[PDB]
Amino acid sequence: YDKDAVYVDTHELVQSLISTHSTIDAKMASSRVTLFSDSKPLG
Amino acid sequence: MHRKKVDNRIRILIENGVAERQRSLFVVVGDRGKDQVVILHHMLSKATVKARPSVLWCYKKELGFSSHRKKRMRQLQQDDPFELFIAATNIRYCYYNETHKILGNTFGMCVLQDFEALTPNLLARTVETVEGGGLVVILLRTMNSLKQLYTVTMDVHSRYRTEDVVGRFNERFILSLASCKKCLVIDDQLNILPISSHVATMEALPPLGPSDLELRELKESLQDTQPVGVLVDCCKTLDQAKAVLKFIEGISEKTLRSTVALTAARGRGKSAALGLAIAGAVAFGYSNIFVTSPSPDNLHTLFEFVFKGFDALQYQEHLDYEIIQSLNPEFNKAVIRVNVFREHRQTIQYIHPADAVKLGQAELVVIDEAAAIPLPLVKSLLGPYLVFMASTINLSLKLIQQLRQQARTLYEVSLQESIRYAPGDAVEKWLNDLLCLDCLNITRIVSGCPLPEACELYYVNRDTLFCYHKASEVFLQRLMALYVASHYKNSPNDLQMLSDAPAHHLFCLLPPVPPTQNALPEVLAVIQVCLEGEIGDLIPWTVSEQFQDPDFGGLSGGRVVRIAVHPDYQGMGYGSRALQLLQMYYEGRFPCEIHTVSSEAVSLLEEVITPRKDLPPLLLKLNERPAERLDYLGVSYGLTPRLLKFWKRAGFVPVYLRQTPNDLTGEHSCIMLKTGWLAAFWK
RNA sequence: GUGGCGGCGACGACCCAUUCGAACGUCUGCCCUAUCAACUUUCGAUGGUAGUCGCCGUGCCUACCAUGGUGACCACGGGUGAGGGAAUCAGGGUUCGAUUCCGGAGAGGGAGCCUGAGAAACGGCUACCACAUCCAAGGAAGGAGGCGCGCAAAUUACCCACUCCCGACCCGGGGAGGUAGUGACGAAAAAUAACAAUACAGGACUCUUUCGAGGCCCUGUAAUUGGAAUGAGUCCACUUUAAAUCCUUUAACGAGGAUCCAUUGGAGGGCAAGUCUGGUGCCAGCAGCCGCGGUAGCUCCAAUAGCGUAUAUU
Ligand SMILES: [Mg+2]
Numbered sequence A: 001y002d003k004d005a006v007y008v009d010t011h012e013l014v015q016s017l018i019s020t021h022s023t024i025d026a027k028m029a030s031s032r033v034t035l036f037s038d039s040k041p042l043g
Numbered sequence B: 001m002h003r004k005k006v007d008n009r010i011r012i013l014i015e016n017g018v019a020e021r022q023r024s025l026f027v028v029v030g031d032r033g034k035d036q037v038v039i040l041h042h043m044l045s046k047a048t049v050k051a052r053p054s055v056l057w058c059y060k061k062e063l064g065f066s067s068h069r070k071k072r073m074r075q076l077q078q079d080d081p082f083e084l085f086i087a088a089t090n091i092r093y094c095y096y097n098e099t100h101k102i103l104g105n106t107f108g109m110c111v112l113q114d115f116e117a118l119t120p121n122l123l124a125r126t127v128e129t130v131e132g133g134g135l136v137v138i139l140l141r142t143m144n145s146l147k148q149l150y151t152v153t154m155d156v157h158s159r160y161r162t163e164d165v166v167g168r169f170n171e172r173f174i175l176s177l178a179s180c181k182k183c184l185v186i187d188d189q190l191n192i193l194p195i196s197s198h199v200a201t202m203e204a205l206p207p208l209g210p211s212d213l214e215l216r217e218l219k220e221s222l223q224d225t226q227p228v229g230v231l232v233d234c235c236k237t238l239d240q241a242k243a244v245l246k247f248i249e250g251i252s253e254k255t256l257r258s259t260v261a262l263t264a265a266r267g268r269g270k271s272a273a274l275g276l277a278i279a280g281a282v283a284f285g286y287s288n289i290f291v292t293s294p295s296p297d298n299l300h301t302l303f304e305f306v307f308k309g310f311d312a313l314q315y316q317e318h319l320d321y322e323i324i325q326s327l328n329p330e331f332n333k334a335v336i337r338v339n340v341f342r343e344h345r346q347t348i349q350y351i352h353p354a355d356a357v358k359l360g361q362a363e364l365v366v367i368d369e370a371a372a373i374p375l376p377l378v379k380s381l382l383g384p385y386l387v388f389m390a391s392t393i394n395l396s397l398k399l400i401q402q403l404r405q406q407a408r409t410l411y412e413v414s415l416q417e418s419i420r421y422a423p424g425d426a427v428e429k430w431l432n433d434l435l436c437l438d439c440l441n442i443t444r445i446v447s448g449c450p451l452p453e454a455c456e457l458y459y460v461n462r463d464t465l466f467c468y469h470k471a472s473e474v475f476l477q478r479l480m481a482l483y484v485a486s487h488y489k490n491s492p493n494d495l496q497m498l499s500d501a502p503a504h505h506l507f508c509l510l511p512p513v514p515p516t517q518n519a520l521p522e523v524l525a526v527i528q529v530c531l532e533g534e535i536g537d538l539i540p541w542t543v544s545e546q547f548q549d550p551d552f553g554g555l556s557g558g559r560v561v562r563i564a565v566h567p568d569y570q571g572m573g574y575g576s577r578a579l580q581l582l583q584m585y586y587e588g589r590f591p592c593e594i595h596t597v598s599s600e601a602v603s604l605l606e607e608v609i610t611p612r613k614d615l616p617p618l619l620l621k622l623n624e625r626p627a628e629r630l631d632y633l634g635v636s637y638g639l640t641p642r643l644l645k646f647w648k649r650a651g652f653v654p655v656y657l658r659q660t661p662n663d664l665t666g667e668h669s670c671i672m673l674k675t676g677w678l679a680a681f682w683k
Numbered sequence C: 001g002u003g004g005c006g007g008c009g010a011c012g013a014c015c016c017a018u019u020c021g022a023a024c025g026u027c028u029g030c031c032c033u034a035u036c037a038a039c040u041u042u043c044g045a046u047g048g049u050a051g052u053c054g055c056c057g058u059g060c061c062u063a064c065c066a067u068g069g070u071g072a073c074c075a076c077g078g079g080u081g082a083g084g085g086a087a088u089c090a091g092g093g094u095u096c097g098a099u100u101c102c103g104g105a106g107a108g109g110g111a112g113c114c115u116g117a118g119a120a121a122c123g124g125c126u127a128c129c130a131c132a133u134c135c136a137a138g139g140a141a142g143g144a145g146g147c148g149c150g151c152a153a154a155u156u157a158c159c160c161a162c163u164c165c166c167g168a169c170c171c172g173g174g175g176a177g178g179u180a181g182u183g184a185c186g187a188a189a190a191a192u193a194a195c196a197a198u199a200c201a202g203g204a205c206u207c208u209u210u211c212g213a214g215g216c217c218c219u220g221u222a223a224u225u226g227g228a229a230u231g232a233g234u235c236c237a238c239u240u241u242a243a244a245u246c247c248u249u250u251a252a253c254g255a256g257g258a259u260c261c262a263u264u265g266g267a268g269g270g271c272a273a274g275u276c277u278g279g280u281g282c283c284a285g286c287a288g289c290c291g292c293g294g295u296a297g298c299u300c301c302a303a304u305a306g307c308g309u310a311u312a313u314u
């Protein structure tokens, strides 16, 4: 501990996971659902 | 040597939690996660100053390390940080199955090794024991869990499911991570996965609670009026002190019949309030006191606060009161009898719940875990004396409703402040909504449609039900609130059966729908159907064993798991309407899945910023979906008069009634069937 | 030809002898105590017959018998620093020599039990008693010395090269055994210098209660000068040894104020615009790194790698 930062001493998928332009919460907002098989999308 | 700077957001998260007395959650991804928890534990030790943290390790079947000193030395026969970590920290190891043992005790940090086997019962018990600023760490070592995580973030609708059981609960768990404020996804390298959308904004708080402020004031103001004041001094939270004072005022009443009720959830001090209340009675002239519970072992914290409350106000361990222990191997260490002779003669005795006799000379009798005692036995314990009742949150409500209608004095308090951690914790709030262990306090009243005439049954889609979209979530909350308001015993594991168990279908009846509506229609009744036989259950085996019928078992049938109607609309006949419609459907009178990802195509999928795939509808009409041919319909329920009339009116013929009543309810399970083989069984 | 004859070894094997022994006897001979004179039959003392057990003989023991056995020539009883001895070999300047031999018992405490030629086991087990440890609380595993003197390292390291022992064995093993540390209680030997020369002065030295009596083939000078010797230290190489250290050889550096600088105890001399105290004007005692300003290494005596003080004492 240097009071400013912390110093301590498969992978391709996570590298894709790190590089995501849109967070999953932002993805959720755009999502919409349809009830009765035909209706105005609630989202 | 080359050292890697890590994001300060990890340290910022830990430091804020311990200061705010709020827990935080971590999700380590990768096979080397066991290395990561070592570093995360060490950071926690730096922040906390109270003591060295304790670690709880939960696993399903297999643990990589030995956890026994001598075995691990021989197994080794150049230096690993993990091996030092195991020998150093005070770790308590538990099984997923054996999680009941760790219910009472408290741990600094909790580790959930096996993600795929997670169960709602497991999550509630382990997280509750975490205290203060401790960490909840969940590991994703299996290759399947990584790619399931991989698919969902690229496209929310797309999901990866191998081959049986869909496993929607794990998908719901992954989706629910974003909503939690104190959740941080991490790799095998100390690297954050940026998906929470609150992670980027996370910042350190600058270097004491509202409810705590009054408790200090009450502890100062009640010094004038004591021995009341000494009792609230031993209290830890404000809500206990309010419960204590309302207990003692009920004691001071010059009335033969009075009832005070505790309605307290787990994690909130409940036996503590009763323990001080018993000491308050001993401080007064009350002499004959009885305590009732299903088992003497169950009440151990109760007598401790009686022991604690006695210690505060005189009552030396041997000079004034003497404790008589169990003196038996079974139900050991329980203090059934305690006698205090400082002021004349006062005695407190634990008795079996089925002891309406021996209660002739009673002043105060306290019932504990009242939900666990059969209901008729509770009525016998009421008596003409003062009664204290405590029932845990998460029929008893009707019984207090009858009391409110009356005779007996009624007092109601609920405990809402957790002893272990501070109110408002994000981890607890996230856990409750994910498990749906909370119900709306107020339900809006709606207009009643014609009961037997203009209601149509609908087919609820299981897949689009559990997707975490706002509209599906609300209807999910509505149906379960009706589902758990039933007289049937409620367990958090019931969610997993509706979510994962195959051969299970959900049907709900709705009011007649005009063209233009609001977001969600009101639900009146829901019925859950489990398909059995040709298309392994209670009905096929119990019938076969008792009647020894070879032809039976080759027939196709389903059983009703749960049938429920809204309490306000109860008693006017919505339930009968659903049964009639369902019979027409399965007899064939009515005229007759989310995109899965290939195993090799998991990597081939790219990010889709705007979802395009059409989600399957929530509710489908009965005519649209094809129907299976079911020869018979069945029900299994604890025999009660009100259901006995109902199912007989529905045409179901009893075929079996269980000899031994259930321990908790005192009810004999009854099985009924409806479709000449029934006539043979009936005779 | 399911012919017939065969060598040199290894291991095992009944019995006899032998060796190593082990175990019961015979005889001979033990220190002090009589203010211990009688003892033994106080679960047999003496013996006879038969038997059990034991490796065998036997009161070793059991049944059935007799009444015996010892004693002032000291029975019996009680004692006895019973670390100390006992011996052995070898020797010219008197021996600061060397080594061995034991009386038994135990393995947290008293009992029971298993193997073998040899143990009632230096080792397993059961019960009981007493301790103490781990655990998911269900169960499981166990049998000695240092400090308290201002002071805790051998409570270790290396090797079977020597001497010998055990094993299937020429070779493996041996905390049997061997090798390696500190040290003004003490004892012994010994450095810190030697040999020459020059220059300048005139006075040494003994006795003597202030005068004095004797007397010289030299003395002093913190004077100068010269080139020979060497070890404290520094540091190559062999040799030594299982490996290494140590001892013994040995190459190269290592001295003029040779500052490469001996101490401990006793007794004296020398001093200012200095401080204090007391008087007999100018004195005396005590003492003096301190003064007006300035801060960039005197002499004599005794012992000698050794020498004092305090208490008691002869
Ligand atoms: Mg000496």
Ligand SMILES: [Mg+2]
Pocket: C256
């Ligand atoms: Mg010279």
